[PDB]
Design a protein around this nucleic acid. Structure first.
Ligand SMILES: CN[C@@H]1[C@@H](O)[C@@H](O[C@@H]2[C@@H](O)[C@H](O[C@H]3O[C@H]([C@@H](C)O)[C@@H](O)[C@H](O)[C@H]3N)[C@@H](N)C[C@H]2N)OC[C@]1(C)O
Lengths: 172, 292, 72, 159
RNA sequence: GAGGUAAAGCGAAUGAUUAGAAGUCUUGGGCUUAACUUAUUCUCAAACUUUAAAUAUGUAAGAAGUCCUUGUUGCUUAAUUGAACGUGGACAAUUGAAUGAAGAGCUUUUAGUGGGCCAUUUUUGGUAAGCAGAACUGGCGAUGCGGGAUGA
RNA sequence: CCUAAGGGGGACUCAUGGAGAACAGAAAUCUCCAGUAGAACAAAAGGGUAAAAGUCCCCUUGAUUUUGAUUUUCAGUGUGAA
RNA sequence: GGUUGCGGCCAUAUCUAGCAGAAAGCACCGUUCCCCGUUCGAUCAACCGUAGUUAAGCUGCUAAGAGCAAUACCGAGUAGUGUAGUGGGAGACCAUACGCGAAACUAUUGUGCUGCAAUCU
RNA sequence: GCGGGGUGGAGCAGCCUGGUAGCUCGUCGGGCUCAUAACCCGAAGGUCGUCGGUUCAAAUCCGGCCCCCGCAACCA
């Protein structure tokens, strides 16, 4: 057909990733891991500092952050809670050149999560990865290749899709 | 601000990989260890069982390597299996077993080692290698070659392996990647493996899906419904198929609906022929004229 | 300039010659060749130096870069 | 102090060819060597096992032994006032057949065939090769080829 | 077959290096000043290089060979496949390039010597040296004779 | 100097740059893209290496036993190493 | 002629930017009971071939395209170099005799070929 | 050719054997005194000569360079 109206070009979420970088370990990291597990229904993974920095108080190869990747319907559910906190309002700068975007949330209990003294309050980063069907050709082991220029995501299409599909405004 | 990367020097000094490596089809490290023969076994070839899976087919070729290219000894495909009584699930684990059995029987018949090394006739799922007969030819030895496919316990490539081994070929292997192997108590549950050989896993799914989600069962198992094949009828399908393969494993090629010249003439209607020198030069002269 | 170079020669050991070149300035073209390339629209200025027309590469960029080029 | 280690002086000799790094093509491993074959020795710098010493790089010798992954090759080495027979064990990556021998065996076959043809015909042919002889007499026509006179040219500068 | 010196190259990688110009200012100064990017421009490398000689260097040019048949084995092959060494048969002075060959092969035993030096060319240190240190060949030493008046 | 920095298998891809995400900035962690190696490989320098020889995971002790053959230095002795 | 599996040589095959592609094949593509692996069925595993799509992969074509490869009354018998002389020149160096002989440059051409097996409007 | 030194305003530690710059005096603020000194309570002040390198980490370990003070320079 050679047409951009084709149904294998429909944009859709590949994955939302949930980052909580606290600058230390022990209690705060455990509590952030717990808030990610509650929110996402999954066990997260902790990340380590790639080198000691004294200005940050951070120390090389030490557990600092925590994140979790969610893909599927639960990804769009967590995204829609996040945008209701953001009030369906984003900026142009939030969108990467490739056609991804994200934002941040300063408190998880704002996402419909009951406060617990055992967890406290934690900020959170969102990042949604956009894609189209056929992304496997760059992921699979055998015969791995690249994506055609038209099939690539970009800032323009991702913004248009976002505004149309969420009934939201993007501020230049 | 940052130097542009794709320069002419970068391209000039670029060394391209082997053609079949840049297509992501050949692991040359593995191929080297698979192919190279003991130099004191001078022209004696090493034979590989090439097992490849597509989205719709299973490819099993017995291959030997040569300077001008690999030479196929025998080949078997899963799309041959309708002739033996298997129509659906042509990428089953069980179709993999059947194709391994087919390629084994076909090779042994081409070699004249049919009655010697008849393999495992009563299939029970046990682990077993083909042993050599006394005062006889040694078994045909082949080495499993799975390409870029990952070694996981339960994978279909080892189903083709199991079929080929039970078919009479001597294929060295350990049982710890078959469906049925338990890594804690390192032994093989021969019942689970023999269930996998006869489509028992698909039969169980048929029964449970019929009893739990009838509409999904209707969509997934449409071909079994239209042929009126219940979950009770699968094991006889695979057993009859094994008997049919053992009775007549000779290769039968599709009777070609068109000869080579018809296929060629009908495909040449669709190949953009390149331009000539004069045509490209005239295009340049015109594109200059429009720029004036 | 000949006298200026004549004076500089005495500052060097050994022998040196003062030669008048046939070429246009510091270009590798003879004066007539340079005038022909200039009047044919095949040279543009680049500060103290020039750039010459290429009949290789992308034709659109060549035509834009030398707009006064007389294709022959 | 001086330095005379095993691979000293091999900076360029053991380098891979430009844009010829990486994996060895499998034709290297599919060749068959027999006792009596004549082989050229060339070290591959990416195969550190079974390497020749730098002395044998670029030398040609006879195969005398065949093992799993290597051949034994006989090389004559000038040591003082005589040759010493050397025996070097080389993995096949460092070895290649010599092409002059294949040419010579072809000539053996051709000589036999020509001799048989002459014997069936009833005559004798000459099988020895000959060096290039002086040319014989000839006549050159001047049709459309009148001799054209050349002269030395005057000196010109172009600077 | 092998090689990376001579030469060459640097709008080719590494490193060095003169000059403008067009952009970028989102990046730091005072229309600039430097930086950055792009296309250019002058000049270089014993311990840089895509390329790459000449001289020098490895190997072969058959009888211990070639072809046909099929013997041995505990090695090798799925094998009746090979591998190595063979029986029997055939191929004869062009037995498989040139030129030469006071013949070829083999052994024992023992002297002196283990300060060198010179010339052409290549070449290192040094301002240089009838200086000091290497490479190949020829010499002197060990050698008179004709020439260079005289002179290793 | 190293029980792994030795052996085997597997999965992955490095320097760097660009564009994005609460606190967060030149430097924290998260995302995608480009990336012929511009990284890494105990230690000098040269050579070698990209579905690896690099990074990470799993299992290990062939860094074992017997005594011959060979290469370099070379007298074709010894030692060292291979 | 198309395509697939396994290849040989390993850019005439690579790279950028467009476009086109019937049949089959390949592919993307659907699902998670089972073997299996994940922070995540994304990759890996398994099941269906059933609901779809040539959009992407893949193949071909286009570009005074980059790169690569090849050629030459291109440069140049130049640079360099073996041998020779009681040759020239204060010397650095140069010519001649008998030989060998580059690279850059310039211009033009090309842009995978192919083995085994299977299959196809 | 060597050897030591280079750290708050001054004179010195810390080096060695990497993870914190310590001492006395001085400077500044307040107090006591009619005032000053002494005395009392407080506070600042050395990115370690400099350019690099290694190290997860440099005053420290590893080179070049700069300044200061010294030792050796013999047989005729
Ligand atoms: C072209 N390459 C040449 C190379 O051939 C050789 O040239 C010699 C030259 O040097 C000789 O000349 C040499 O020897 C003579 C005499 C003692 O023989 C001396 O008089 C002369 O000064 C000396 N240079 C000359 N007679 C022959 C050329 N082939 O050596 C010099 C060179 C430049 O390398």
């Amino acid at each position: 057909s050679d047409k951009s109206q084709n149904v294998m070009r429909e944009l859709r979420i590949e994955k939302l990733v949930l980052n909580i970088c606290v600058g230390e370990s022990g209690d705060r990291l455990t509590r952030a891991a717990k808030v990610l597990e509650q929110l996402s229904g999954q066990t997260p993974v902790q990340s380590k500092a790639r080198y000691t920095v004294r200005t940050f108080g951070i120390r090389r190869n030490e557990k600092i952050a925590v994140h979790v990747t969610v893909r599927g319907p639960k990804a769009e559910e967590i995204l829609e809670r996040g945008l209701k906190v953001k009030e369906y309002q984003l900026r142009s700068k939030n969108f990467s050149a490739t056609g991804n975007f994200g934002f941040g949330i300063d408190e998880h209990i704002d996402l419909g999560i009951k406060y617990d003294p055992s967890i406290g309050i934690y900020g959170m980063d969102f990042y949604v990865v956009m894609g189209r069907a056929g992304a496997r050709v760059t992921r699979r082991k055998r015969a791995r290749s690249t994506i055609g220029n038209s099939h690539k995501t970009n800032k323009e299409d991702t913004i248009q899709w976002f505004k149309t599909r969420y009934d939201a405004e993007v501020l230049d | 601000m940052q130097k542009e990367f794709r320069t002419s020097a970068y391209h000039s000094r670029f060394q391209t990989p082997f053609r079949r490596r840049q297509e992501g089809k050949t692991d040359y490290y593995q191929r080297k260890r698979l192919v190279t023969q003991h130099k004191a076994k001078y022209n004696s070839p090493k034979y590989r069982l090439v097992v490849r899976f597509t989205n719709k087919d299973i490819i099993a070729q017995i291959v030997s390597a040569h300077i001008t290219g690999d030479v196929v000894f025998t080949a078997a495909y899963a799309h041959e299996l309708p002739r033996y009584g298997i129509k659906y699930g042509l990428t089953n684990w069980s179709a993999a077993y059947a194709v391994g059995l087919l390629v084994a029987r076909r090779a042994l018949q081409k070699l004249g080692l049919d009655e010697t090394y008849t393999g495992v006739e009563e299939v029970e799922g046990e682990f077993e290698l083909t042993e050599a007969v006394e005062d006889g030819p040694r078994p045909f030895k082949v080495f499993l070659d799975i390409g870029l496919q990952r070694t996981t316990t339960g994978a279909r490539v080892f189903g083709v392996l199991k079929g080929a081994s039970d078919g009479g070929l001597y294929v060295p292997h350990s049982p710890n990647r078959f469906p049925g192997w338990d890594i804690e108590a390192e032994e093989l549950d021969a019942e689970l493996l023999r269930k996998y050989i006869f489509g028992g896993h698909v039969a169980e799914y048929m029964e449970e899906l019929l009893d739990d989600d009838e509409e999904k069962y209707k969509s997934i198992f449409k071909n079994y419904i239209e042929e009126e094949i219940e979950s009770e009828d699968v094991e006889e399908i695979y057993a009859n198929a094994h008997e049919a393969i053992r009775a007549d494993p000779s290769f039968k090629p599709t009777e070609k609906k068109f000869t080579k010249e018809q296929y060629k003439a009908e495909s040449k209607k669709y190949r953009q022929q390149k331009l000539t020198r004069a045509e490209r030069q005239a295009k340049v002269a015109k594109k200059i004229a429009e720029f004036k | 300039v000949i006298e200026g170079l004549r004076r500089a020669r005495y500052k060097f050991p050994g022998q040196q010659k003062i030669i008048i070149s046939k070429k246009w300035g510091f270009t590798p073209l003879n004066r007539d060749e340079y005038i022909a390339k200039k009047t044919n629209g095949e040279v543009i200025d680049d500060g103290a130096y020039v750039k010459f027309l290429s009949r290789k590469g992308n034709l659109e960029a060549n035509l834009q870069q030398f707009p006064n080029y007389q294709y022959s | 102090g001086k330095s005379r280690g095993y691979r000293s002086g091999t900076r360029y000799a053991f380098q891979r060819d430009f844009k010829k790094h990486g994996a060895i093509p499998l034709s290297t491993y599919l060749k068959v060597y027999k006792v009596g074959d004549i082989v050229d020795i060339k070290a591959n710098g990416s195969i550190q096992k079974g390497m020749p010493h730098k002395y044998y790089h670029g030398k040609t010798g006879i195969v005398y032994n065949v093992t799993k992954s290597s051949v034994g090759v006989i090389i004559n080495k000038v040591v003082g006032n005589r040759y010493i027979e050397k025996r070097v064990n080389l993995r096949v990556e460092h070895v290649k057949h010599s092409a002059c021998r294949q040419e010579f065996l072809n000539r053996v076959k051709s000589n036999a065939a020509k001799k048989r043809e002459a014997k069936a015909n009833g005559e004798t042919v000459y099988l020895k090769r000959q060096a290039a002889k002086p040319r014989g007499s000839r006549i050159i026509s001047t049709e459309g080829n009148i001799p054209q006179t050349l002269a030395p040219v005057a000196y010109e500068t172009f600077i």
